[PDB]
Amino acid sequence: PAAKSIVTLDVKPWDDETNLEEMVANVKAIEMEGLTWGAHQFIPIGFGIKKLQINCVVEDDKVSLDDLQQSIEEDEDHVQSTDIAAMQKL
Amino acid sequence: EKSHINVVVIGHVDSGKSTTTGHLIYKCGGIDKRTIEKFEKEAAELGKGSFKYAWVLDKLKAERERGITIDIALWKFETPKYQVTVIDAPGHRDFIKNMITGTSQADCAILIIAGGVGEFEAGISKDGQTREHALLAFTLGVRQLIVAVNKMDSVKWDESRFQEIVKETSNFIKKVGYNPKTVPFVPISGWNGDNMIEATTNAPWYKGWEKETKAGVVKGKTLLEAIDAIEQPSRPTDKPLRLPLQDVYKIGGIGTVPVGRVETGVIKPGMVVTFAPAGVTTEVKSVEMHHEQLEQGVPGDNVGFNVKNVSVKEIRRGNVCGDAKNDPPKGCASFNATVIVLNHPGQISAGYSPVLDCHTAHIACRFDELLEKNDRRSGKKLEDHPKFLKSGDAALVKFVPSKPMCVEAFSEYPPLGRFAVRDMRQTVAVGVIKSVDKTE
Lengths: 90, 440
Ligand SMILES: Nc1nc2c(ncn2[C@@H]2O[C@H](COP(=O)(O)O)[C@@H](O)[C@H]2O)c(=O)[nH]1
Description:
Chain A has 90 residues and is α+β, with helices and mostly antiparallel strands. Chain A is built from 2 helices and 4 strands. Chain A has helices at 20-29, 65-72, and strands spanning 4-12, 35-46, 49-59, 81-89.
């Protein structure tokens, strides 16, 4: 069986008005072989701003996290940046 | 409150480190407990009710793979003395940068070693991911290490096999740089639980592990005692403020709100801060984290704070916030750092200008000059002005950032003194900043 890692990505909006539902739908629409989207929650980071924290399981040899982060960040209308909140081997 | 420490668990794919780490989190923490509960109940089907923790761990893994579990990848567990934030090191190649510039650097590394003859040898290969991880930890100053020889059941808890493994592993880690005498070697069974939390009854010859510390010799029997014996590291609370920005928001009726992790010092409302490399100075109106407003943000806190007369446009990700009246952060003309070249399909010559990731900065920096090549472990200068670097070399290099950049010497501000060098879809080197030519 293939090596996997479970990753929790933080996806940040532009402001407190950003449509977070559209933002997460855009992330989940991203399809790649070896990529499995998991649970997500909108977490407050202060001053009314909420970030998207979403889990995903990736096959190490098939899914580039650098590329994945870059792809999410293409949704400029909703995403300011992305960061890895945490990652573990499975 | 229990003190906080970070631990990274490394080892070869067949070492069984995931089951090992999972067992600790399962019995000493509370991660995805509702999933655990479901499987503990289901296990009644196996017989009349009895179940192995390793079975439950197996089912949790598959559940996580389906993407239906609820908890995030930030895992923690407790010991008598600590709340441990643990990372079962991913094999993923992108984890290398994350290990270098990510938050939560390790206070101790736990190397899990498979005891089987074939698996043991495969694990200490000179080109293995496990050695790279060990090297990275050592290079980043993770001086505390614990070794657990797993799968002792597969070699029938044989004392001689354990001793030979300790011998060869000591050689392995010594070449990396760790002094084996300070490393506890714990024979365990991650699957059967031997010496995990309770002492084993399968090895009469086992007297326990031991390690030399500065105060004396510490001994124990289990992996948990080994972890609990990790030495308390000193935190940056006392050093000047340093808060790398991750994001900057423009919130109506409030203004500019940068967000970032407090790496050193403390941020409080009322302080007057400066943002480097821009050089903008202002007062901190308020600070917030999650739902609560704070009286202070301490090292480790990812906080958002509000400042006035600062268009979001004048400060950005990568900039560093600090105290304007206590060694304020500054940009630099250049910085000299010890670079360790990792295994990669290439060779480095002066002029090389790859992207460098340092705290939240992502900037291409020129390897302006190859000042010296050094013995990696001792730091002794082997030659002046080497003409190129190849995998394995440790060297002092003069860097010139292509964009305004704020960095620190690793000795003074660790989180802003270590960096990852990216190229060929991988981290090709790791640097530790030794001096900075600041900007005035
Ligand atoms: N014999 C034996 N195998 C183990 C032990 N702990 C883990 N393993 C096995 O080692 C392999 C995996 O490690 P993991 O996949 O959990 O990192 C699996 O095949 C797992 O069942 C142990 O104490 N004894």
